[PDB]
């Protein structure tokens, strides 16, 4: 019965700063070494959120940590306009409790479009009025929703995760106080967040090229991250699943 919800709820991942030191002019190198110190501090809480999510470890080992590299992006990108339609009604961007973005700050990233976009994003979650427990589902299932072209080690047993995790979504959807039009309304909000992760990934991908020229720092794992993994995105290799 609530045993799916049960879960997600109690392994949801609390508040993350970011360390952003505010007294800091308002610099490209300064905002884009906060957000990619961030990332890392997120990507850890990401680990094992996902490795304690119903069914996970039934991956292959193999799998699991692609899956994780593959959707981390569209993962962060739709919590953090969760927590910005929750905390600021998705006036701003608020990456974290220490580094939240005016337009200013927008600006100064030089990433000014895609914030808008993360902000009308951000702003879906008011305007459908998402529930918390379809924001739970839904992200759950952003996790299983970026595999390679050529599929994981073992796709088969991620096939059944993937639809399982779908069935789940139907039936949080099911069991509120029009179904189909729900289910229409959130698949077409979960593909609209891909695109939204696939202009970031090549914004990191740039910025990490340029990095000692634009004096923007990336922590280990996700300097990896970037030239590993994202290049695998951008270059086709590995796709987003869109529903429609
Ligand atoms: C997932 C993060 C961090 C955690 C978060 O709440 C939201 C996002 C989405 C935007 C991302 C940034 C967009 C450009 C970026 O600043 C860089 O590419 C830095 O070079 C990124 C990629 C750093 C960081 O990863 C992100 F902030």
Known sequence: QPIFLNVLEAIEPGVVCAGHDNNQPDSFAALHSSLNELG????????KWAKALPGFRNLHVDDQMAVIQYSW????????????????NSRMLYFAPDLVFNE???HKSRMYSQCVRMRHLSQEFGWLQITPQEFLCMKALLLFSIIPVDGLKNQKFFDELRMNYIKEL???????????????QLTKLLDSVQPIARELHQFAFDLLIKSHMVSVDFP?????????????????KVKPIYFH
């Open 40 to 47: 890392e501090r997120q990507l850890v809480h990401v680990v």
């Open 73 to 88: 992006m569209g993962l962060m990108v739709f919590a953090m306009g969760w927590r910005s339609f929750t905390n600021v």
């Open 104 to 106: 200013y700050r927008m």
């Open 170 to 184: 139907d039936r949080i959807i099911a069991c509120k106080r029009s179904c189909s039009r729900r289910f229409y």
């Open 220 to 236: 280990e794992m996700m300097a990896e991250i970037i030239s590993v993994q994202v290049p695998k995105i951008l270059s086709g």
